[PDB]
Amino acid sequence: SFSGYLKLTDNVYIKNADIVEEAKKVKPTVVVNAANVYLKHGGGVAGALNKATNNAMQVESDDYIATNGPLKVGGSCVLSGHNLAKHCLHVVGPNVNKGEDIQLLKSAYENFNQHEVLLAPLLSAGIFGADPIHSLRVCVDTVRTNVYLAVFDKNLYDKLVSSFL
């Protein structure tokens, strides 16, 4: 199962890891993708997860969008986890660089409560432009299920752990 995680709360764990390598190792039931409403997995966590699936995640996602239309900011959909997980929960956190409402971050984390255990990144962090310290706070105050957070950046991981209240 999940190894080397630091326990933050009753249900939130954190590790300095590449979520792709973590998913390939653990093969979790659910890996969370830091998705956008169009499921265009170009960069950040989404680009990395999609590249690990040899673009199969993008092909599946394009068919999903053709059928259903775009997701809402704060929403999610469950698709295949391909070679990374049983399922991928594509969750859209607000993108601060596109001027989206940061208050939607709690709605985005609420999607995690539909899954007993997840491997996930910090929503709206990285190229989505939100403060990762704030994202971790919203995560711990919103998610009640077991969430294993993978933080790619070592310096950010250290800052997150050392400043955790």
**CA torsion through residues 120, 131, 90, 82, sign:** negative
Q: Which residue is nearest to ligand WQ4 (CB)?
A: 48
* Cα 51 to Cα 23: distance, rounded to the nearest angstrom: 13
Residues 106-125 that bind ligand WQ4 (CB under 6 A): none
Tell whether residue 45 is a contact of ligand WQ4 (CB under 6 A).
yes
- Please say whether the beta carbons of 116 and 145 come within 8 A: yes
Which of 8, 32, 35, 48 is the binder for ligand WQ4 (CB under 6 A)?
48
Which of 44, 93, 94, 132 is the binder for ligand WQ4 (CB under 6 A)?
44
Tell whether residue 126 is a contact of ligand WQ4 (CB under 6 A).
yes
Candidate segments 6-14, 15-23, 69-77, 157-165, binder of ligand WQ4 by CB under 6 A = 15-23
Taking CA atoms, 9 is separated from 140, 143, 162, in Å, by 7, 11, 14
